Design a binder for this molecule. Structure first.
Ligand SMILES: NC(=O)c1cc2c(-c3ccc(C(=O)NCc4ccccc4N)s3)cccc2s1
Length: 338
């Protein structure tokens, strides 16, 4: 039933828990594989089943995820705020299985199908931005950090009209803040995390900003190789991290010298070796507007919306979380409202 690496040996056509008729294979991650099934007990209703790897630590992550899903699902009984619905859980041959509403595509896979370095229609990005901000609102009302928002953890329905935030395996209550510089997938990781400053709901807003750029361009906004590189790429957009913010950072000495100069680590072209370059200034060079427009000819209505997305991204991607746009302000933004 279980392979050497602890994954359940999915067979298409098999029944799980004497009720879930497995007809489709959806994918495999680090922590699980996911199938499509019909519920024999509920008029053959379509479900997704996530089968956690037979591993103590990963099973415990799965039980943690059940707790956060129950809290979010119970807090949103009419399902208005775009978080994945858990129906129930069961055990099958010692595997923890979570039964979800039937979604089978994440926004990474959508980007891969609908182009390469292409991106989605600006009308779709508008709609998806509103739905993501509604998810942030519920998270905040529930005092929850998702702490891993990225295209891979956003699911879409068949018609790709509705998205749901998924995978609460990295989630926490806002109080118990592990001072770790590795919270959130690196590309989507806010600068307050990296420098070791106090963080909150702002890390999820940051991650959504990174996601929205990627949804329209088809390109990762900040493809940094390390934490130091991530800061350089952030500061290429906004300029040097403010002095007040640097001095608060528990990890400031990994990134900045005594005079608050940035210590940029570069892998030398010639040698495969790291070197350091001290920079007192980082001049903003990241041209967001030019990035979003792909040297492409748009109708003026779409051109208006891309400028508005750019303004919204400028307000999301403030380095200081205290200066970052609120969920309320984001929902009321011209990009979504006009
Ligand atoms: N992480 C989670 O908690 C959940 C994921 C899902 C899904 C999934 C949607 C798509 C998934 C996926 O892994 N595709 C990537 C992939 C894997 C292997 C080979 C190719 C690709 N593209 S999993 C669906 C329903 C519920 C949950 S909960």
């Amino acid at each position: 039933w279980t392979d050497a690496e602890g994954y359940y040996r999915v067979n298409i056509g098999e029944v799980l828990d004497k009720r879930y008729n497995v007809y489709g294979y959806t994918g495999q991650g680090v922590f699980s594989n996911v199938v499509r099934a019909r519920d024999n007990a509920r008029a053959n209703q379509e479900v997704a089943v996530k089968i956690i790897r037979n591993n103590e630590l990963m099973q415990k992550t799965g039980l943690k995820e059940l707790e956060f899903l129950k809290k979010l699902n119970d807090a949103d009984p009419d399902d208005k705020f775009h978080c994945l619905r858990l129906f129930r859980h069961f055990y099958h041959k010692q595997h923890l299985c979570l039964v979800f509403e039937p979604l089978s595509m994440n926004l990474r896979e959508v980007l891969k199908k609908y182009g390469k370095d292409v991106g989605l229609h600006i009308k779709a990005v508008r709609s998806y931005s509103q739905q993501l901000f509604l998810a942030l609102k519920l998270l905040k009302r529930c005092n929850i950090l998702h702490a891993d928002i990225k295209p891979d953890n956003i699911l879409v329905n068949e018609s790709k009209t509705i998205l749901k935030l998924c995978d609460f395996g990295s989630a926490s209550h806002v109080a118990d803040n592990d001072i770790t510089p590795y919270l959130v997938s690196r590309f989507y990781r806010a600068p307050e995390i990296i420098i070791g400053k106090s963080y909150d709901y702002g890390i999820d807003m940051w991650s959504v900003g990174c996601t929205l750029y990627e949804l329209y361009t088809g390109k990762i906004l900040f493809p940094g190789k390390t934490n130091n590189h991530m800061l350089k790429l952030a500061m290429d957009l906004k300029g040097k991290m403010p002095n007040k913010m640097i001095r608060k950072g528990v990890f400031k000495d990994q990134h900045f010298d005594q005079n608050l100069n940035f210590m940029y680590i570069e892998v030398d072209k010639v040698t495969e070796r790291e070197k350091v370059t001290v920079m007192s200034t980082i001049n903003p060079t990241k041209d967001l507007l030019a990035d979003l427009i792909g040297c492409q000819r748009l109708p003026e209505d779409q051109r208006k919306k891309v400028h508005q997305l750019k303004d919204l991204l400028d307000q999301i991607l403030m380095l200081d979380p205290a200066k970052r746009i609120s969920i309320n302000q984001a929902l009321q933004h011209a990009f979504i409202q006009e």
